[PDB]
Design a protein around this ligand. Structure first.
Ligand SMILES: *C/C=C1/C(=C/c2[nH]c(/C=C3[NH+]=C(/C=C4\NC(=O)C(C=C)=C4C)C(C)=C\3CCC(=O)O)c(CCC(=O)O)c2C)NC(=O)[C@H]1C
Ligand SMILES: *C/C=C1/C(=C/c2[nH]c(/C=C3[NH+]=C(/C=C4\NC(=O)C(C=C)=C4C)C(C)=C\3CCC(=O)O)c(CCC(=O)O)c2C)NC(=O)[C@H]1C
Lengths: 315, 313
């Protein structure tokens, strides 16, 4: 039965059990994963409102100094570019990316998107023809099976992940591993099916709009935003569009129990519906840098197109 | 059918026989790169472009005996695996060579039956592609998508004019969006007869998705031999971007005052929906890595055109 979200934990909401899976408001956890930092800022003035508690250690500045400046002063070269790329009223799915040379922290990748009147800024550390070669190989795959196999093998070669599966949704939202590339010694998941509650209904809706999410370390504690609520609204900060957003503790316990230290998945979206997932596992924690993740994002789109094409060749 | 090419004493092309020019077998290439053909098994260099000596820095005869194994040691096994016998002519493999004579070359290979076609071009060596991809996806409708696409391509390439050219059901073309330098004519809204892009070239554009003319006044460079030794027949060059552009179409570009031309197929439901069409007033060799960006954009636009057309119908 579909039911509306509970309030999050920090607003006195209940703790999540196998009973109330579908009602966890996973888009507003009030916290991020510790391998990057996040700031929120007023979309018109550029006043800095919220920051992750670890921000001082990524950005090399005291909180009170950060919060006491506008983005115009903090990001003089990027602030006008942000404002042109992310105009008021734009969708929350639109992202702008730049690379910064920050004194204390080396090269940072900056990813920005806009939710209403809020700008959300994510900072992460950042670092030949493999993509072009893959694009052509995907297109020349003769059928859906060969496409799925080429796609899994390519992603594994690009990333070094211990396991890369193509997980396909059935009409009842159960899922099946229809191809996989895996490290020697791992047991096969190929052909196994899994019940619809394994990926609940409100995570499926979010995966249709925001096409990549990850869990870099399944044992890492989440880092709170400070303050936790958006001071504009005294309400929760929407983090559905932020790759840094903390992962549901139910999902992390599920992955730890499988022996997974690192998870990543890309959405495959066909005709406006979530067709499947490029799902990746690593046994140890593992951070895939932003520019490599971009390659996977591009492959997500290519695969969406090629899945349509291969399936049309099939009636 | 097709007329024989000129160099096999076929008729010269006019506006009477637009449909019958064998644009895929011109026997020549554009001079900003070099092409070798080679045997699929032996790696034996069978044809070369008369200009190969320039790019490769090799005494002419040296090449036309040697083997790819010898000539490209690191690459030759990769090719063997990447382009297995029986693969499609559409499948391409690329690498960057740090080659003694020329700082860096791009190498592009595909296979047509028993022949490997190798293309060499100068090359080199950020977020504009990722930023463009998200911009295309958030365009609210087909019109805005067209506008974003043309603007994005112009910004990435510096081309004087970028158009989105859409085919009607009878192959009548219409310029539905345009991004252009100040002080050019506006082709926005204009329609053009189907024969401007004749049937045999629309078929080839459905399979091989990018073509260009780098300089509309440059002479083609012959293949030597012109005929493939294997077959004593013309080498198919339609999957080669270095392939000499139809002088009929090169006259059409000079008469418009265009010095450099490039387009990307937008393919939807197995059919040619439209072109990203690009113009430059002067000669312009777009480097391979930037062309790759446009090739990606072509696929992304193909996806988004279907998405956007579905939310009208
Ligand atoms: C009480 C709720 C439960 C629950 C919640 C839940 N699940 C997700 C998302 C995912 N679950 C996945 C499960 C699988 N991984 C596999 O390898 C297989 C099969 C071989 C399955 C079935 C996957 C892949 C995802 C997607 C993300 C990823 O891991 O890469 C969420 C949402 C997480 C978030 O965005 O923060 C939630 C809340 N899962 C249950 O099994 C029950 C107990
Ligand atoms: C007697 C045959 C003729 C003919 C042949 C021909 N045309 C092409 C390819 C193209 N023609 C194009 C025409 C236009 N370019 C524009 O900008 C506009 C309108 C504003 C039109 C109508 C285009 C865009 C192409 C595609 C190639 C490109 O991107 O430049 C070929 C094929 C050439 C080749 O692939 O090597 C041929 C043989 N065109 C005519 O107009 C008649 C006289």
């Amino acid at each position: 039965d579909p039911l509306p979200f509970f309030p999050p934990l920090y607003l006195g909401g209940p703790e999540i059990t196998t009973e109330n899976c579908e009602r966890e408001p996973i888009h507003i956890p009030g916290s991020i994963q510790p391998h990057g930092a996040l700031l929120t800022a007023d979309g018109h003035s550029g006043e800095v409102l919220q920051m992750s508690l670890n921000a001082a250690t990524f950005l090399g500045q005291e909180p009170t100094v950060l919060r006491g400046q506008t983005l115009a002063a903090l990001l003089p070269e990027q602030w006008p570019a942000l404002q042109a790329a992310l105009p008021p009223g734009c969708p929350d799915a639109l992202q702008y990316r730049a690379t910064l040379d920050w004194p204390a922290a080396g090269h940072l990748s900056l990813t920005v998107h806009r939710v209403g009147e809020l700008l959300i800024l994510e900072f992460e550390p950042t670092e030949p023809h493999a993509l072009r070669n893959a694009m052509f190989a995907l297109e020349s795959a003769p059928n859906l099976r060969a496409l799925a196999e080429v796609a899994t093998q390519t992603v594994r070669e690009l990333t070094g992940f211990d396991r890369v599966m193509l997980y396909k949704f059935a009409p009842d939202a159960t899922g099946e591993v229809i191809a996989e590339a895996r490290r020697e010694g791992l047991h096969a998941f190929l052909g196994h099916r899994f019940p619809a509650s394994d990926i609940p209904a409100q995570a499926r809706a979010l995966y249709t709009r925001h096409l990549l999410r990850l869990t870099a370390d399944t044992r890492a504690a989440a880092v709170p935003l400070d303050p936790v609520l958006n001071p504009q609204t005294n309400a929760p900060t929407p983090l559905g569009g932020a790759v840094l957003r903390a992962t549901s503790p139910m999902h992390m316990q599920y992955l730890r129990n499988m022996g997974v230290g690192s998870s990543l998945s890309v959405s495959v979206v066909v005709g406006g519906q979530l067709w499947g997932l490029i799902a990746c596992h690593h046994q140890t924690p593992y951070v895939l840098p932003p520019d490599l993740r971009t390659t996977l994002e591009y492959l997500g789109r290519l695969l969406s197109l090629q899945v349509q094409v291969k399936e049309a060749l099939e009636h």
